[PDB]
Amino acid sequence: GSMNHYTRWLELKEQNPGKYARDIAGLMNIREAELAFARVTHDAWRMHGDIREILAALESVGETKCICRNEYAVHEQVGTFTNQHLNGHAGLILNPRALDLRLFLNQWASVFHIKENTARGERQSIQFFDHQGDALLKVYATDNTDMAAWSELLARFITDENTPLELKAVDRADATVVEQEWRAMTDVHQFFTLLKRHNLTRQQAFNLVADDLACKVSNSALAQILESAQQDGNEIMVFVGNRGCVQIFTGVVEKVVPMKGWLNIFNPTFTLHLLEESIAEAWVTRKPTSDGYVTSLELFAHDGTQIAQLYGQRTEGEQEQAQWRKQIASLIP
Numbered sequence: 518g519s520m521n522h523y524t525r526w527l528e529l530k531e532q533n534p535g536k537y538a539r540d541i542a543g544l545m546n547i548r549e550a551e552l553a554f555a556r557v558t559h560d561a562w563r564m565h566g567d568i569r570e571i572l573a574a575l576e577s578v579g580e581t582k583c584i585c586r587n588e589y590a591v592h593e594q595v596g597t598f599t600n601q602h603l604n605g606h607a608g609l610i611l612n613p614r615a616l617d618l619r620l621f622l623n624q625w626a627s628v629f630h631i632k633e634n635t636a637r638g639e640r641q642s643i644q645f646f647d648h649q650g651d652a653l654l655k656v657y658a659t660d661n662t663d664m665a666a667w668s669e670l671l672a673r674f675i676t677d678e679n680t681p682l683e684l685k686a687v688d689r690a691d692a693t694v695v696e697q698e699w700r701a702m703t704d705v706h707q708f709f710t711l712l713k714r715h716n717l718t719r720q721q722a723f724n725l726v727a728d729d730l731a732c733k734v735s736n737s738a739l740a741q742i743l744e745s746a747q748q749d750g751n752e753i754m755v756f757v758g759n760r761g762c763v764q765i766f767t768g769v770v771e772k773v774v775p776m777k778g779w780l781n782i783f784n785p786t787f788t789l790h791l792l793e794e795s796i797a798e799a800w801v802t803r804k805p806t807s808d809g810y811v812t813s814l815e816l817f818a819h820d821g822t823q824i825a826q827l828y829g830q831r832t833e834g835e836q837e838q839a840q841w842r843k844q845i846a847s848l849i850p
């Protein structure tokens with residue numbers, strides 16, 4: 518099983534130097550947590566412990582570079598595990614414009630440390646995986662990480678026991694009612710509960726309601742909006758997530774560059790990689806806040822995966838940013 522997986526990963530990595538662990542796990546038809554598991558005794562170590570305690574321990578290491586992704590978009594943010602509030606219904610690590618995470622901790626299953634050779638030299642990380650075996654979040658040490666605290670954290674949580682993963686499979690509405698309840702919300706954070714009640718996916722909800730609430734726009738909309746944001750210099754939010762973790766960039770888009778088959782943002786502390794041909798549907802949605810409404814661009818793949826979502830920057834108590842509204846208005850047929 519896992520020896521053969523390790524060997525095969527070494528072969529495929531040599532053959533495909535441009536491809537990363539997630540892609541090679543994909544070529545092998547295994548989940549990424551299974552590739553981490555196979556690398557134990559080589560360049561990975563299993564970790565154990567209460568997930569909140571591990572996350573709290575990360576505050577001690579200082580700067581990290583965190584990667585959160587789905588199949589179609591990769592979000593990389595340099596910052597610190599400060600301002601943690603992990604204990605509620607969902608968890609958060611609240612640092613607008615730096616490391617800003619929203620956590621669904623019931624999805625968090627296994628954790629590994631990887632200390633690996635790469636073309637750019639040794640990299641160390643702590644990697645979290647869900648019950649399906651998919652990556653949730655990867656936390657990399659940088660040249661600024663407190664490596665004494667990093668080593669102390671690893672000694673605290675690394676275990677020699679690499680126990681079996683036991684991976685698991687993933688688990689007609691009234692349009693007038695859905696619409697009226699959407700209009701009646703007083704905060705965007707109620708929307709997920711709305712979907713859950715009506716047992717709807719996001720796109721199913723968007724297809725039900727009037728166009729002033731959810732309007733389909735060009736699949737080129739993300740490119741258009743990133744070009745406008747880069748030109749205009751207004752702050753936006755870029756959300757990229759998966760079933761267990763969403764990472765949120767807030768700030769100005771400094772550089773947008775297509776490269777190697779992806780649309781990239783190259784900012785000083787943040788990088789986005791988005792596979793543009795993966796966008797199957799793009800929606801502009803309007804949802805109420807306590808002060809007014811806000812407007813989002815929401816992107817979906819063919820399988821219905823939410824690739825990314827964008828908003829303007831906004832502080833509690835303020836109206837939606839004027840420039841962002843103007844940029845979105847340019848998308849509406």
Ligand code: HEM
Pocket residue numbers: 607608609611619620621705706708709804806811813828831832
């Ligand atoms: C102090 C706590 C939080 C603050 C200040 C905050 C702030 C925001 C802001 C500014 C937006 C953009 C829409 C708007 O302008 O109102 C937003 C949307 C969102 N937040 Fe939060 N948030 C918080 C907690 C959370 C938590 C705990 C979660 C989930 C774990 C979360 C998940 C989201 C999601 C998914 C959206 C997009 C909603 C949609 O359009 O459907 N947030 N949040």
